[PDB]
mmCIF file of C-alpha atoms and ligand atoms in Angstrom:
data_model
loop_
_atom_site.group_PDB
_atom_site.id
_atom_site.type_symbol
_atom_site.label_atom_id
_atom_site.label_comp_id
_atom_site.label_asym_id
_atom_site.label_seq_id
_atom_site.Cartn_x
_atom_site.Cartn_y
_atom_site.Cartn_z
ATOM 1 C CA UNK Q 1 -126.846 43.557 85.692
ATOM 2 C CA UNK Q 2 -127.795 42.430 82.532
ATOM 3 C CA UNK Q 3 -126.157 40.177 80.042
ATOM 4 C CA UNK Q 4 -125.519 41.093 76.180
ATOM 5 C CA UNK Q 5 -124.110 38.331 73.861
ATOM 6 C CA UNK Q 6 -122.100 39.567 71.436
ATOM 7 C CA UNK Q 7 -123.412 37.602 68.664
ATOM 8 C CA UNK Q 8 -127.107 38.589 68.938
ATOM 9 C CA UNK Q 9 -128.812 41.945 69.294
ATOM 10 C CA UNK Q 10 -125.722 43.418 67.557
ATOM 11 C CA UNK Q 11 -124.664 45.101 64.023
ATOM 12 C CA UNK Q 12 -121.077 43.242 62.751
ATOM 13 C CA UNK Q 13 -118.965 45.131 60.455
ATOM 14 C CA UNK Q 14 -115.812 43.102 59.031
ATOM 15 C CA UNK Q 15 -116.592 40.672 61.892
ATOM 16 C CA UNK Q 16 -118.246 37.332 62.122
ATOM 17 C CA UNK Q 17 -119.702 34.957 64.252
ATOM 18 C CA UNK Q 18 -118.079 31.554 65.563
ATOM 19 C CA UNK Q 19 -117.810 28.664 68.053
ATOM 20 C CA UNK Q 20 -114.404 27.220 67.539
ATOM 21 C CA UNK Q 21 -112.999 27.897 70.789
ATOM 22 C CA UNK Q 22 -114.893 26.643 73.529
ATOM 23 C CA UNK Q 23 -116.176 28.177 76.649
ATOM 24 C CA UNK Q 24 -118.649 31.581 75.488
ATOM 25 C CA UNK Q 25 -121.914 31.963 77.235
ATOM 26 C CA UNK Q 26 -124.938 31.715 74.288
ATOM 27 C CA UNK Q 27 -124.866 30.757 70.886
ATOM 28 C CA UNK Q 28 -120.955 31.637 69.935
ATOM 29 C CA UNK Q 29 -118.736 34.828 70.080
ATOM 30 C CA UNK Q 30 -117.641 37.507 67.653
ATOM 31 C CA UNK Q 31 -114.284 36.856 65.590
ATOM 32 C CA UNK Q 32 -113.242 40.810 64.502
ATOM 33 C CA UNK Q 33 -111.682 40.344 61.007
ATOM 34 C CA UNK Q 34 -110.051 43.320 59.992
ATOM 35 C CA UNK Q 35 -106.977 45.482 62.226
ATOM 36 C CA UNK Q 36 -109.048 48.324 61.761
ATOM 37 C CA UNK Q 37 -112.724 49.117 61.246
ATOM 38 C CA UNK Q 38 -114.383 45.944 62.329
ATOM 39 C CA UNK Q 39 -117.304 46.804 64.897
ATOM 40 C CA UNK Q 40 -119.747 44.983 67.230
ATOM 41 C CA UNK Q 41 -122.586 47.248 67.846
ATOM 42 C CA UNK Q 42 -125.167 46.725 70.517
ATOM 43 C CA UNK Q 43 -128.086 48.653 69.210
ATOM 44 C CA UNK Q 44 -130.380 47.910 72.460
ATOM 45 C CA UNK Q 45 -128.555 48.228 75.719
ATOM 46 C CA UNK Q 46 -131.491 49.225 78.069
ATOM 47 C CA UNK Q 47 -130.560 50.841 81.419
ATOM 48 C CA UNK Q 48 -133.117 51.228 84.429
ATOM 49 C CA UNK Q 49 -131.149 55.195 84.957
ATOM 50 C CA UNK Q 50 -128.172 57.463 83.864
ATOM 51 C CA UNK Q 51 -125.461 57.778 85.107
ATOM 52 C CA UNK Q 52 -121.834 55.681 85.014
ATOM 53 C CA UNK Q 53 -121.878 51.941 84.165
ATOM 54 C CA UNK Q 54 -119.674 48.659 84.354
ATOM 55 C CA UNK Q 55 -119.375 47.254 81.249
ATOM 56 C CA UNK Q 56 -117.742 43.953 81.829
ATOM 57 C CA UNK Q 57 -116.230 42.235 78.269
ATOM 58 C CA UNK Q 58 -116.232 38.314 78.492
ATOM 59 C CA UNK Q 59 -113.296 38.181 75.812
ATOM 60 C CA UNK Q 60 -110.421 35.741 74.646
ATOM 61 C CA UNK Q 61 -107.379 36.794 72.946
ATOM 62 C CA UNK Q 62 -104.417 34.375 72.952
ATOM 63 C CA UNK Q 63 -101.647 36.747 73.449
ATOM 64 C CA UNK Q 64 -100.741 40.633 73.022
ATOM 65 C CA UNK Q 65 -102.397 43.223 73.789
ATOM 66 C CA UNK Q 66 -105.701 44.606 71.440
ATOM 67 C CA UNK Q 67 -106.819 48.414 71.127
ATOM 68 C CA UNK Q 68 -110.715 49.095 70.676
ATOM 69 C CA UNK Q 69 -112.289 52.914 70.641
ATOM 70 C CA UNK Q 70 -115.872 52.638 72.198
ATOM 71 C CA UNK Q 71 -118.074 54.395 71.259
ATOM 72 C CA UNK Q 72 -121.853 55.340 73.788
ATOM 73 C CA UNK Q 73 -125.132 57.122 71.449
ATOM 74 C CA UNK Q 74 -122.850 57.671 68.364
ATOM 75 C CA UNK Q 75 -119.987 59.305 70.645
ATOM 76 C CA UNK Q 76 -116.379 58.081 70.757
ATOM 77 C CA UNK Q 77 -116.040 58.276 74.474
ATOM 78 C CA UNK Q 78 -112.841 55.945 74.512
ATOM 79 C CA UNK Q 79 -109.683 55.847 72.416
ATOM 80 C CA UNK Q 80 -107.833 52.940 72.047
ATOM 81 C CA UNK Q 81 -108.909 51.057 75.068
ATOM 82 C CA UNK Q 82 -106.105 48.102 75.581
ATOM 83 C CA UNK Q 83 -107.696 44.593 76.022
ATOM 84 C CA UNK Q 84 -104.941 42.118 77.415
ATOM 85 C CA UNK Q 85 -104.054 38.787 76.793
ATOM 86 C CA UNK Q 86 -105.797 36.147 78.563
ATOM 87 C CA UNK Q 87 -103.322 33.661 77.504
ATOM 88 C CA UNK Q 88 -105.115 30.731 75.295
ATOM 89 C CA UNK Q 89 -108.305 31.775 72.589
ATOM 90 C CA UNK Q 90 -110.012 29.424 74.962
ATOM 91 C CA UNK Q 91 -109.572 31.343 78.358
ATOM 92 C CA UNK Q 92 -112.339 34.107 78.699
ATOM 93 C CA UNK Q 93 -110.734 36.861 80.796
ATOM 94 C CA UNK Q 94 -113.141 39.805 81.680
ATOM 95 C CA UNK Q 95 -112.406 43.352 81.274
ATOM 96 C CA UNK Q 96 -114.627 46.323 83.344
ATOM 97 C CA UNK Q 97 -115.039 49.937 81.890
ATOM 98 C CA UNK Q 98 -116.960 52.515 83.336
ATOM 99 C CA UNK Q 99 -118.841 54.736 80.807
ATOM 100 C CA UNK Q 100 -121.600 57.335 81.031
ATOM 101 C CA UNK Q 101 -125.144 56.043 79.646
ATOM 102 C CA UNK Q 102 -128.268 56.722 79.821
ATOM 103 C CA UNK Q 103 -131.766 56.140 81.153
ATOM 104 C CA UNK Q 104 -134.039 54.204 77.994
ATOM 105 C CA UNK Q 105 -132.326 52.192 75.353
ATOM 106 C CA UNK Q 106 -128.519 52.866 73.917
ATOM 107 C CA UNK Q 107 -126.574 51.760 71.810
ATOM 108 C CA UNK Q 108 -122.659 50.663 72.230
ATOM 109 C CA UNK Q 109 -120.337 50.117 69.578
ATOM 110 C CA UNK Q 110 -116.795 49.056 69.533
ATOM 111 C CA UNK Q 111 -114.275 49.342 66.861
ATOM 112 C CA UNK Q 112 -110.878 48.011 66.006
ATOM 113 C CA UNK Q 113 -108.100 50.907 64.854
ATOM 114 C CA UNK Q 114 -104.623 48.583 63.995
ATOM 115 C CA UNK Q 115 -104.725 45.738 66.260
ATOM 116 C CA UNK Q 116 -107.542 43.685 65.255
ATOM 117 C CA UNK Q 117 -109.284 42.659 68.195
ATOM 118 C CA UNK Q 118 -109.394 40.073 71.168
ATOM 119 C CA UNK Q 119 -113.066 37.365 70.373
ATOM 120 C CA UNK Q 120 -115.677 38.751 71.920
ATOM 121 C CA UNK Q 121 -118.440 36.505 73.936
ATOM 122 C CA UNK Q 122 -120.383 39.001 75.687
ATOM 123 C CA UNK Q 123 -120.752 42.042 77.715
ATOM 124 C CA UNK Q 124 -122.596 42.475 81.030
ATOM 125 C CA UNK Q 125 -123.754 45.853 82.320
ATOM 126 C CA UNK Q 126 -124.549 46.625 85.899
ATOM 127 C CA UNK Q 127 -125.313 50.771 87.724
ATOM 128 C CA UNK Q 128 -122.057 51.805 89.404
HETATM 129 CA CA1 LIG S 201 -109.797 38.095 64.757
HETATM 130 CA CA1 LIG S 202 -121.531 34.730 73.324
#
């Protein structure tokens, strides 16, 4: 698998970059500002072949649950994915998704639509 920090390699919108709450992997993790329309892009995800993926989000979110679309290459190819509480802003729970990339370089892009989002450390993606 490989490991992609959230706060480096990516495009923010309405989004920012922080270290209060300790515990993420790197050099901080990605505070989503708005309840909809903030976005973390990874613009060079770089897979060894196509086919389905684990995407596993290192995240915190201190109670509730959060809604993201995700969006592979441009394409919204999930709606309103929930991300649950982990309980504190410093626990980092994981969340897995299994998505259809390809081969080469890709890009990954998630997106908040009314419930802000949970912070965002990282995500790591391994071959199904
Ligand atoms: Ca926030
Ligand atoms: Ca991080």
């Amino acid at each position: 698998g490989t490991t992609y920090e959230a706060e480096t390699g990516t495009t923010l919108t309405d989004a920012v970059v922080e270290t209060l709450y300790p515990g993420y992997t790197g050099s901080g993790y990605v505070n989503f500002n708005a309840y909809t329309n903030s976005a973390i892009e990874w613009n060079a995800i770089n897979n060894m072949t196509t086919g389905t993926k684990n995407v596993k989000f290192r995240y915190a979110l201190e109670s509730g649950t959060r809604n993201l679309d995700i969006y592979v290459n441009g394409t919204k190819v999930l709606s309103n994915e929930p991300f649950t509480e982990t309980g504190s802003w410093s626990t980092w729970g994981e969340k897995t998704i299994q998505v259809a990339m390809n081969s080469g370089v890709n890009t990954l892009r998630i997106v908040t639509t009314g419930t802000e989002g949970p912070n965002m450390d990282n995500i790591t993606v391994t071959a199904s």
